[PDB]
Design a protein around this ligand. Structure first.
Ligand code: CR
Length: 652
């Protein structure tokens, strides 16, 4: 049946679950979804019941979202409660470390400072900061309060054991666990900072705004970023200890009924949600507060499919709570490289052994899966087209090293010379060949500039037909692709018109125009490419389209290009930046131009001589450049990316 077994953890919850079930029966057709109510003793029993296939769904705080994803439960987030509005939905809060302007210390210098905590046991004010700080704490690290009391010179930790650890109540004698304590709760711990008692205050992004109405006052405060720099208090999105989901419905990963759950809760919110004012109300109960959902919720949002627990919680949160849960601290260490194929994996393997392990290897099925592994620490680095750096960026990773091949490569529009009528100005109703959608040369530049002419990104209705791997299988821009069966129109090397070369091949065989890079025609003409399609081609038979409306020969790309290409680039997490720079330059200043593939273009492109420091352009926005970014923002209206949908769900 189309039935969601909801798990309750109390008699009151079970009663609301039953009223829920009975009221849904009135609003939903026989073919629609229904509720069953299962009552357990605790959130952990509910997690186990759901994993046992005795229940389907429960709503959890972020600590329990974490418990629920660990084996053997293997549960994941499927629906989010949201608070206030739509344009701004407040699905998450941010744990931040607030400090005074000019106190002159960074996160890696908290040892010896005076800390303000909302309350011992609370997330923003204790579990996250002490989680992150866990391994800077002095041995022995158990009992944990003792070790915290031995790290901050003094603190106000509400509800800590002041009697056995007085240092923790220096700033609030007694450690009062109630509002009768002036330094308790979010405003308490902030007040503790303001009133000059302490140096740092572990609170949420929003506390300072709730407690200081005038910008002038807030300008006297900053945030500690995990990168050991500071930022103003309204830049919390880029400077926080952890991003925290407020209330999260979870299911089984495999066969969890995610879709029924969403269908149920969505019709549940249209009929019974905020301000719908029926006798039954999803977000309150005469039986008690916060039953089955927070009473403060304004609705539900579907969790994007690509999302797992580790990505929903995010790197920073998992790090903090995994330290807290496991309590495991160590002794630069290996760079885990991510391979996209058996060819990349064998190359990476031989790199590992010819480098004393200073390089380890971990492989995944697509670029997006690899990126997702770098986000969450299963992996550390991989080199990416401009288009994928944008995604890796929106997903919170930074570029460290660019690939160099001599400002980098040039995106050019190639035509067959004989069709001399063809011009950049009018390609309407002509046949296009792109490397893949969301790549620099193939799409983001060409279609970038194109979007500007036609105020829309529905390109399968500008071009007659084409080959643009990563397009929807039933699009006019998959009709020229050459892969057979499931591989037709895939953006991997099982589709022969994939990449710079494929797209040129596409032009040779089927299309009018190919969007590729300046050295692509030369490398696959004159016999340099021996493959049947390329072998007998002559460079002279191909021209480039120039912006002004004219044409020029291939080798004349200097004055006939569409735009300069952001070079391909290695990317990693901010916490790995330093170490990737160190170990790759120590690998390339040994195995550089002393980058060769048993196949072709493995790991890094084969025409790659050195890996350049970026100096100051170590952000996706500063590395890709202002104009490249505007373009992709224009193109994401029509983008089909499952990772970016997940990443932008956590950061619009
Ligand atoms: Cr590229």
């Amino acid at each position: 049946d189309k039935t969601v077994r909801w798990c309750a953890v109390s008699e009151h919850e079970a009663t609301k679950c039953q009223s829920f079930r009975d009221h849904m029966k009135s609003v939903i057709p026989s073919d629609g979804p229904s509720v069953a109510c299962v009552k357990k003793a605790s959130y952990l029993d509910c997690i186990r019941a759901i994993a046992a296939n005795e229940a389907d769904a429960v709503t959890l705080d972020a600590g329990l979202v974490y418990d629920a994803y660990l084996a053997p439960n293997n549960l994941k987030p499927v629906v989010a409660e949201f608070y206030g509005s739509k344009e701004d939905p407040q699905t998450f809060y941010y744990a931040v470390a607030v400090v005074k302007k000019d106190s002159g210390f960074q996160m890696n210098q908290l040892r010896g400072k005076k800390s303000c905590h909302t309350g011992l046991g609370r997330s923003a004010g204790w579990n996250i900061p002490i989680g992150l700080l866990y391994c800077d704490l002095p041995e022995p690290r158990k009992p944990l309060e003792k070790a915290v009391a031995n790290f901050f010179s003094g603190s106000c930790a509400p509800c800590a054991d002041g009697t056995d650890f007085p240092q923790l109540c220096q700033l609030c004698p007694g450690c009062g666990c109630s509002t009768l304590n002036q330094y308790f709760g979010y405003s308490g711990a902030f007040k503790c900072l303001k009133d000059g008692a302490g140096d740092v205050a572990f609170v949420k992004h929003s506390t300072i705004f709730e407690n200081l109405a005038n910008k002038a006052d807030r300008d006297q405060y900053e945030l500690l970023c995990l990168d050991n720099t500071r930022k103003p208090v309204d830049e919390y999105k880029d400077c926080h200890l952890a991003q925290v989901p407020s209330h999260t419905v979870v299911a089984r990963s495999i066969g969890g009924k995610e879709d029924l759950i969403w269908e149920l809760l969505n019709q549940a919110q249209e009929h019974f949600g905020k301000d719908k004012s029926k006798e039954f109300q999803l977000f309150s109960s005469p039986h008690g507060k916060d039953l089955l959902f927070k009473d403060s919720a304004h609705g539900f949002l579907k969790v994007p499919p690509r999302m797992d627990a580790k990505m929903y919680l995010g790197y920073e949160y998992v790090t903090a709570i995994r330290n807290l849960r496991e309590g495991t601290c160590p002794e630069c260490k290996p760079v885990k490289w991510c391979a996209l194929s058996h060819h990349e994996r064998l190359k990476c393997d031989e790199w590992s052994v010819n480098s004393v392990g200073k390089i380890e290897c971990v492989s995944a099925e697509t670029t997006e899966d690899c990126i997702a592994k770098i986000m969450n620490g299963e992996a550390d680095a991989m080199s990416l087209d401009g288009g994928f750096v944008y995604i890796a960026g929106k997903c919170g990773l930074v570029p460290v090293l660019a690939e160099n091949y001599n400002a980098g490569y040039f995106a050019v529009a190639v035509v067959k010379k004989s069709a001399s009528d063809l011009t950049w100005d009018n390609l309407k109703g002509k046949k296009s060949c792109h490397t893949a959608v969301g790549r620099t040369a193939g799409w983001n530049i060409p279609m970038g500039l194109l979007y500007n002419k036609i105020n829309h990104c529905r390109f399968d209705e500008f071009f007659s037909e084409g080959c643009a791997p990563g397009s929807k299988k039933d699009s006019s821009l998959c009709k020229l692709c050459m892969g057979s069966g499931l591989n037709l129109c895939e953006p991997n090397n099982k589709e022969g018109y994939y990449g710079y070369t494929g797209a040129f091949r596409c032009l040779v065989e089927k299309g009018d125009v190919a969007f590729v890079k300046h050295q692509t025609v030369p490398q696959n003409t004159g016999g340099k490419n021996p493959d049947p399609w390329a072998k007998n081609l002559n460079e002279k038979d191909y021209e480039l389209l120039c912006l002004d409306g004219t044409r020029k020969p291939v080798e004349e790309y200097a004055n006939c290009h569409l735009a300069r290409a952001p070079n391909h680039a290695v990317v990693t997490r901010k916490d790995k930046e330093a170490c990737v720079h160190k170990i790759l330059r120590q690998q390339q200043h040994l195995f550089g131009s002393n980058f060769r593939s048993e196949t072709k273009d493995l790991l890094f492109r084969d025409d790659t001589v050195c890996l350049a420091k970026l100096h100051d352009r170590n952000t996706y926005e500063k590395y890709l450049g202002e104009e490249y970014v505007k373009a992709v923002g224009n193109l994401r209206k029509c983008s089909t990316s499952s990772l970016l949908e997940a990443c932008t769900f956590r950061r619009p």
